[PDB]
Amino acid sequence: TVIKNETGTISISQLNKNVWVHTELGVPSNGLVLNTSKGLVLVDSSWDDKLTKELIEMVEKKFQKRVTDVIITHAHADHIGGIKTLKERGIKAHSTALTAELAKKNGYEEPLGDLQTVTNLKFGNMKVETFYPGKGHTEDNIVVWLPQYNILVGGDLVKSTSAKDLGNVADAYVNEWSTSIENVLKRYRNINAVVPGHGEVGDKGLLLHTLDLLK
Ligand SMILES: [Zn+2]
């Protein structure tokens, strides 16, 4: 159920009634779109302001609702890049304090810094848990859990099946990354789907894979 756009740059595919994956090329990058009864919520926006705008615009039109909220899963350019777009449209950009301080330190506008280690948000009907499992791909990476769907957005912490290595480890803690992955496996013992930061949606298996990439 791939609804692409004008250019193939942006693309969304349904995971269920209310959860879609968004993917933009910048190397393809995933996030979620949550159709809740109070607006659209993005897990992660995009590479930059341009693609973040195109994304918001494409979902607002399709779903007939405003993007009200974004969850930023770490402060790297590809995740925080459209932050200026979010703040200036009045889109709440949720992040941990650490993601925000990293965003600030890298010259970006700051997201809210409102997420704790475990934070439980509700958007209309939609329950979203954010989970900081520890350092991994970055020091600040969080996962997002949709407890009504048992869906985990692992973000960059989680490598797709097709990832044969760890990608960008310049900011990674390859020693803590295994434990952080394990922390996810323990918190979420029954996962229906996992969305890696890049690549094709999988299950629990993507976390086992990522563990293996770390040996
Ligand atoms: Zn990253």
Rounded Cα distance, 83 and 134, in Å: 23
Residues less than 5 Å from ion ligand 1, measured at CB: 76, 156
Q: Tell me the CA–centroid distance for residue 37 and ligand 1, in Å.
A: 30
Experimental structure resolution, Å? 2.3
Q: Tell me the CA–centroid distance for residue 168 and ligand 1, in Å.
A: 7
Structural contact between residues 22 and 9, judged by C-beta atoms closer than 8 angstroms: no
Domain count, the chain: 1
Rounded Cα distance, 131 and 24, in Å: 24
SS (H, E, C) 158-188: CCCCCCCCCCCCCCCCHHHHHHHHHHHHHHC
Q: For residue 129, what are the domain limits? A: 1-215
Structural contact between residues 146 and 34, judged by C-beta atoms closer than 8 angstroms: yes
What's the length of the chain? 215
Method for structure elucidation = X-ray
Report strand pairing: 2-4 vs 10-16: antiparallel
Q: Tell me the CA–centroid distance for residue 74 and ligand 1, in Å.
A: 7
Question: Which CATH number covers residue 150?
Answer: 3.60.15.10
Rounded Cα distance, 44 and 41, in Å: 9
Q: Tell me the CA–centroid distance for residue 138 and ligand 1, in Å.
A: 6
Q: Which of 183, 179, 178, 205 is nearest to 194 (CA)?
A: 205
Residue 116 CB neighbour total at 10 angstroms:
11
Residue 103 vs residues 5, 17, 152: alpha-carbon distances, Å: 29, 33, 24
Half-sphere exposure at residue 129, Cβ-oriented, CA atoms within 13 angstroms = 16
Q: Tell me the CA–centroid distance for residue 79 and ligand 1, in Å.
A: 7
| Dihedral angle computed from the Cα positions of residues 19, 2, 94 and 149, in that order, rounded to the nearest 10 degrees | 20
Q: Crossing angle for the helix pair 174-187 and 205-213, nearest 10 degrees?
A: 160
Which two tokens mark 24?
């933009």
**Those residues with Cβ within 8 angstroms of residue 20's Cβ, 6 or more apart along the chain or in another chain:** 12, 13, 14, 32, 33, 35
User: 191-215 burial, b if ≥16 CB within 10 A, otherwise e?
Assistant: bebbbbbbbebbebebbebbeebbe
* Identity of the residue numbered 89: R
Sole residue written with tokens 């109070």: 38
* Identity of the residue numbered 38: K
Rounded Cα distance, 157 and 181, in Å: 7
Q: Which of 139, 138, 149, 154 is nearest to 209 (CA)?
A: 154
DSSP calls for the chain: -EEE-SSSSEEEEEEETTEEEEEEE--EEEEEEEEETTEEEEES--SSHHHHHHHHHHHHHHHTS-EEEEE----SHHHHTTHHHHHHHT-EEE-BHHHHHHHHHTTPPP----B-SEEEEEETTEEEEEE----SSSSS--EEEETTTTEEEEETTS--TT--S----TT--HHHHHHHHHHHHHH-S--SEEEESSS--B-THHHHHHHHHT-
Q: Which of 104, 59, 108 is nearest to 82 (CA)?
A: 108
Vertex 164 angle, CA 160 and 165, to 5°: 100
State the catalytic residues: 74, 76, 78, 137, 168
Structural contact between residues 108 and 75, judged by C-beta atoms closer than 8 angstroms: yes
Which two tokens mark 89?
């449209």
